[PDB]
Curated annotation (Swiss-Prot), chain B:
Changing C271A: Abolishes dependence to reducing agents. The modification Phosphothreonine is found at T51. Changing S159A: Abolishes activation of serine/threonine-protein kinase activity and has only weak activity. Belongs to the protein kinase superfamily. CAMK Ser/Thr protein kinase family. SNF1 subfamily. The chain holds residues 1 to 333 of 651 of the full protein. Potential therapeutic target for treatment of somatic tumors, such as brain and breast cancers, down-regulation of MELK inhibiting tumorigenesis. This is Maternal embryonic leucine zipper kinase. The active site is at D127. It comes from Homo sapiens.
Length: 315, 318
């Protein structure tokens, strides 16, 4: 729509665009003040899905959730500045590998479980967990995306039987489907005819390949209980015996990224730059309006974590 | 439907790689080893697609992104396409701020080639804009997105900044010439001739037809822009006069060669020979099957073998 280049003007204040990385257009970009790379979602206003995703992401902050840095609304456009995830979809990685070893699966699955536990702890349900919605960042860490359908009906193969007719329990079902696909490279319930796939899900029966360990088979049946009330709880999952093989500590699901605690180095650089003192800056930062100040703080925090200088660009 | 059975027939001929773009995954064609882009459509999730497909089956040209292979399954449509690593013309303009007149002409002669050929096959693209132009590895332009293209002279039934004033009221190939005018201006200025925050204002600027002329524009450039950006369609320069127009031929001294260098009728003997060896046929039999152009794996394999040869690499299948 439109084709206007003036629509980009306020954005170009803060970011330097680079090439499209996704065709809801997604461009790679550099945040000018920090030099950090980000992915920018460009929407031309021609959904309540976006408003749902945006509002969820304002309240969620976690090492396995793809981070919202900046929301820029223009007369004609909505811009979402998001964490940049060069590693691609978990889905791509699954196809490319045929199927994952139990050790490989466990590494990634502990991360999916980290993210989803945190989501539930903030009173949300994703309702659309599937490998297309999981991305690898530069460090090969998984990032949960796509909060359009979240609550305070995804894709069918991943949808719990309870959910189809008529919350956190369905996410556990979906993670169950995820775990099987990771270790098998194909779905537990699948068919060309969508009507047939529906009945399979409802019976709840599925093939179990020779290469799955008994441990895996047990976890799978605990997550894929067609009775929602029989599904394993998030609590028991966090330290489940399969989950802890090779690790010996439960999944650390608690967020490492606070809304309350500010980092002093970053506040310092922001104060100096905007010509303020700390209390003024800290108050402004803690309003989290997800304006340009939000982005610069989080990208500076992200810059520090990388071991780069805590420095904003001289302008 | 998140079903993976959908990929079964595809993974026979192609090995998928990461999404680069209705999703787009990069892929390798197994027999040839050539890189391709596979556009993935979920059927439960437009007739725009059927339109692009029937157009691309009939259009074949060095500046049109080539359709190699169409694969349809119960839930999905696959489209195998020429791979364009160089990106959108739009992004390259932004990265350069604006193009010199010489650079513009280099790029613009290719756009003219593509669109002239399109019109010559009885079509109008109807959505020319720099997002729909891609660079390949040789930094050559490839025209894409035939979702909106139509037969002007045919049976009945884009983005605003690029739309001719006539399209705003309620016709022909002449609206493409207008879009090519917008394109040329953007190439040389780095901003639109008609643009505004308010869309109603934008309709009106376009229909009035008046626009800024920056000082860095040459009289020649101004002259051509004036010929393409006629709000009255009958006054607009014709494709014929564009092809050999003086600005167009500055530095070249030959008109734009728009005629296709990629044939439906002439088959390449090496490629056919290699395909004969592989499918256990003789020449006349093999050639008969290739000429049916079904855009099955055979069409894909012939065209990618033809491309492998053009690249000057060995004509060899795995």
């Amino acid at each position: 729509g439109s084709g206007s280049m003036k629509d980009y003007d306020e954005l170009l204040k803060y970011y330097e665009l680079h090439e499209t990385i996704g065709t809801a257009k997604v461009k790679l970009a550099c945040h000018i003040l920090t030099g950090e790379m980000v992915a920018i979602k460009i929407m031309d206003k021609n959904l309540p899905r976006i408003k749902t995703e945006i509002e969820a992401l304002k309240n969620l902050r976690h090492q396995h959730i793809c981070q919202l840095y900046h929301v820029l609304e223009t007369a004609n456009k909505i811009f979402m500045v998001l964490e940049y995830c060069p590693g691609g979809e978990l889905f791509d990685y699954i196809i490319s590998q045929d199927r994952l070893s139990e050790e490989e699966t466990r590494v990634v699955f502990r991360q999916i479980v980290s993210a989803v536990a945190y989501v539930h702890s903030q009173g949300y349900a994703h309702r659309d967990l599937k490998p297309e919605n999981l991305l690898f960042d530069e460090y090969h860490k998984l990032k949960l995306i796509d909060f359009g359908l979240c609550a305070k009906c995804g894709s069918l193969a991943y949808a719990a039987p309870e959910l189809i007719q008529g919350g956190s329990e369905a996410d556990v079902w979906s993670m169950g489907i995820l775990l099987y696909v990771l270790m098998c490279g194909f779905l537990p319930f699948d068919d060309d005819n969508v009507m047939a796939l529906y009945k399979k899900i409802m019976r709840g029966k599925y093939d179990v390949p020779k290469w799955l360990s008994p441990s895996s088979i047990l976890l799978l049946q605990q997550m894929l209980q067609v009775d929602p009330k029989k599904r394993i709880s998030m609590k028991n999952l966090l330290n489940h015996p399969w989950i802890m093989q090779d690790y010996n500590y439960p999944v650390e699901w608690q967020s490492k990224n606070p809304f309350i605690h500010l980092d002093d180095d970053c506040v310092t650089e922001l104060s100096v730059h905007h010509r303020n003192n700390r209390q003024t800056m800290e108050d402004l930062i803690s309003l989290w309006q997800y304006d340009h100040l939000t982005a610069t703080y989080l990208l500076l925090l992200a810059k520090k974590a990388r071991g780069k200088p805590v420095r904003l660009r001289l302008s």
